Amino acid sequence: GQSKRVDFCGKGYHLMSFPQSAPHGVVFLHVTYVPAQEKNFTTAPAICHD
Amino acid sequence: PPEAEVQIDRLITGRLQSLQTYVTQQLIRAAEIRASANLAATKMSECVL
Numbered sequence: 734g735q736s737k738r739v740d741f742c743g744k745g746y747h748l749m750s751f752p753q754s755a756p757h758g759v760v761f762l763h764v765t766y767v768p769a770q771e772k773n774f775t776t777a778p779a780i781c782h783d
Numbered sequence: 784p785p786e787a788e789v790q791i792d793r794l795i796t797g798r799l800q801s802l803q804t805y806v807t808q809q810l811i812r813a814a815e816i817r818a819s820a821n822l823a824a825t826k827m828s829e830c831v832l
């Protein structure tokens with residue numbers, strides 16, 4: 734599946750995971766999406782038309 | 784010495800049992816606290832972040 738829980742399946746936004754076995758345990762590989770470059774824009778709650 | 788040693792072993796065994804009992808209870812309580820801490824950490828991530 735795909736989790737929406739914060740930090741449950743790794744940092745960033747979760748996309749998918751893959752298990753790998755290990756002695757006495759399990760290792761998960763968690764694939765996530767992380768925002769990168771960003772820009773500063775002006776904003777507003779609403780646009781007034783007519 | 785001979786007689787004192789007998790009386791002392793009775794006290795040592797008893798004293799040691801008291802310490803073992805203490806430690807066992809601390810291990811059990813620590814486990815309960817750990818569960819609470821894990822829950823608190825989950826809430827921090829899902830409720831605060």
Ligand SMILES: *[C@@H]1O[C@H](CO)[C@@H](O)[C@H](O)[C@H]1NC(C)=O
Binds near residue numbers: 771772773
């Ligand atoms: C956005 O504005 C802040 C405040 O002036 C500034 O410190 C920051 O470097 C700017 N940056 C971006 C989008 O990288």
